[PDB]
Ligand binder design. Structure first.
Ligand SMILES: Nc1nc(O)c2nc(CNc3ccc(C(=O)O)cc3)cnc2n1
Ligand SMILES: Nc1nc(O)c2nc(CNc3ccc(C(=O)O)cc3)cnc2n1
Lengths: 263, 263
């Protein structure tokens, strides 16, 4: 969908769980969510990542009916009021399916096709783009952490292909903050360029995460300059897309980095 | 002076030319300048770079008597009111000399000892630290730009040594924005790690410069995320000290970068 290699692309985050709003009942949450997306697009987002379940640590599981009730109305308004690609942040195949029928472009799966056995064939079925993100429970790795991550991608890519997903539709993401402690997260960021060998576009998400908070012990929103650092280093290491809360600031840093390393 | 390699050090900029103040007469400018330095120290500056002549493009030349009248009172108050190292941003040996007699730690010479034949022996005489910055008039280079820069450092380092300057006192700086157009500035930033071969600590200054403005065409103060990008890339490339207007923001990015690459 994006012209990979020409520049860095920015994915803005739109969470529409109840905790995401001042008033989690308010019938105006739908319009608030849409205003937030209009703002991110004006700040220069290339795609919006919409989620109805939070994968942020110790948020609760949402059943897929509930998840769809949160995202379906937002997708409909986005699609009519805003000319922007949408990504659906879900690991559930039934959620993805409904989203894709409504014209969402990409499934962002934070379990990398492993949590729902139907996810790969849904992606194939709609010819969707997918982000395959590395994830696991706990922080144990018997091999080199970057070797494990690459092994995991190989298996997920083969699952995708067995269901007729085209290679050009896949984006990989190393899953900062997922199945990884501080040191492992640092190590993955340091070695991120090793993922370029697999030949696929890379997506990175660090924005406001605890890996930054451990270096910069301020409240999440005040970690922006850490996130900008990882955006910048990521692009130098081959990152194509960054998933961020603060679209304008990360885009400005990304343009500066693009001007130095992209041809 | 700094424990090079342990972390990135931050140099805050303190310009005390008349244009630097709301009211360039006001007898309170001295106290305003000192408040600005107290602020930078609280934001985490490691050293303050004080200048009484602006080397920003198309600012006028200041004679050294005038330059000293601007900086001497500021150095005296800094030295009594603030426990922070000071750098004197001057290419004039007589200015440097007076500053060094008052307890300034480093001479920051934006002509890399070439504009004043006495500068090297002044540095030697006081056992000062020096930043030797690459500079030239116009933008012509017959050799590879990084080869020219390194050749220039070799000559300036030999001048310093002939006057008994110790090797451990020298810091090099490639002089972004000086004798270099957009493309050359980009190229130097891209190749900055080649300067690590000379074995010396490196200082970088990009903050608010036109090289960033050409990628991010906003007013100088609004170029902060570009500057943060160059701080981050610089540290990865071996930079030890960054010279910045916005101390807190660059320090936060530098700590994030230090946590990823420094051992
Ligand atoms: N593709 C993709 N890539 C991500 O990196 C990501 N992150 C989240 C949010 N996840 C986390 C994880 C950990 C932490 C913490 O340690 O603080 C915070 C948030 C949600 N969707 C995501 N999708
Ligand atoms: N050591 C050191 N290193 C610097 O990089 C530096 N820069 C300035 C300020 N110089 C400039 C140059 C060019 C530009 C523009 O193109 O906009 C702006 C400011 C003053 N002292 C400096 N000292």
């Amino acid at each position: 969908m994006f012209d990979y290699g020409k520049r860095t692309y920015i994915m803005g985050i739109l969470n529409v769980t109840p905790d995401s709003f001042s008033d989690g009942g308010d019938f105006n949450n739908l319009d608030i969510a849409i205003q937030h997306a209009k703002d991110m697009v004006d700040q220069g987002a290339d795609i919006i990542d919409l989620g109805g379940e939070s994968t942020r640590p110790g948020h609760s599981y949402v059943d897929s009916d509930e998840e769809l009730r949160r995202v379906i109305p937002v997708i409909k308004k986005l699609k009519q009021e805003l000319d922007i690609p949408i990504s659906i942040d879900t690991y559930k195949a039934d959620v993805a399916e409904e989203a894709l029928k409504l014209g969402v472009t990409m499934v962002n799966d934070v379990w990398g096709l492993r949590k729902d056995k139907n996810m790969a064939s849904v992606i194939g079925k709609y010819d969707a783009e997918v982000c395959i993100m590395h994830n696991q429970d706990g922080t144990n790795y018997d091999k080199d952490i970057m070797e494990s991550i690459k092994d995991f991608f190989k298996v997920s890519i083969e699952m995708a292909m067995s269901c007729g997903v085209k290679k050009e539709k896949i984006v990989l993401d190393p899953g900062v903050g997922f199945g990884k402690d501080f040191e492992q997260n640092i190590e993955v960021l340091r070695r991120l360029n090793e993922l370029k060998d697999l030949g696929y576009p890379i997506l990175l998400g660090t924005s406001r995460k605890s890996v930054i908070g451990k270096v910069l012990p301020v409240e999440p929103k005040k970690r922006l300059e850490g996130t900008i650092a990882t955006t910048v280093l990521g692009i130098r290491d081959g990152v194509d897309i960054v998933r961020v809360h603060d679209v304008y600031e990360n885009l400005m840093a990304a343009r500066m980095t693009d001007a130095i390393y992209r041809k």
